[PDB]
Amino acid sequence: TRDQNGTWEMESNENFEGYMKALDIDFATRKIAVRLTQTKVIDQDGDNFKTKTTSTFRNWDVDFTVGVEFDEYTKSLDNRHVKALVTWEGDVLVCVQKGEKENRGWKQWIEGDKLYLELTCGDQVCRQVFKKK
């Protein structure tokens, strides 16, 4: 389905460290930034997404409209400027973050009961899985 609304609780974080290392985040910051407990809240109405992903380390909060490009600052993750565009491929929500980093973005989809998020940078993929709570 393309309906990703809901409050989603993480039950899977694979290779966040490798993703972060691809974004040139400090060892000292990586050794401390991984969280296996997180809540992702998606408020989606048509094309308009409001998303809040909270852990005790940071809040990764971003809003976007599907099919409208926007200039993004990646904030306390890696402090970079990108041109972000989020679209559908089928029922896969695809974000490309165009900038200094190659193959940077993420894809997010529902399968079975679950929300899957694949973050990419360079040769690194972080795979996360959330259950609906």
UniProtKB/Swiss-Prot annotation:
Major place of residence: cytoplasm
UniProt-annotated location(s): Cytoplasm
Tissue-level expression: Higher expression in adult small intestine and to a much lesser extent in fetal kidney.
CDD domains per record: CRBP2
Residues reported in the UniProt entry to bind all-trans-retinol: 40, 108
Domain of life of the organism encoding this protein: Eukaryota
Role noted for this protein: Intracellular transport of retinol.
Protein family per UniProt: Belongs to the calycin superfamily. Fatty-acid binding protein (FABP) family.
Domains (record comment): Forms a beta-barrel structure that accommodates hydrophobic ligands in its interior.
Protein name stated in the entry: Retinol-binding protein 2
Natural source organism: Homo sapiens (Human)
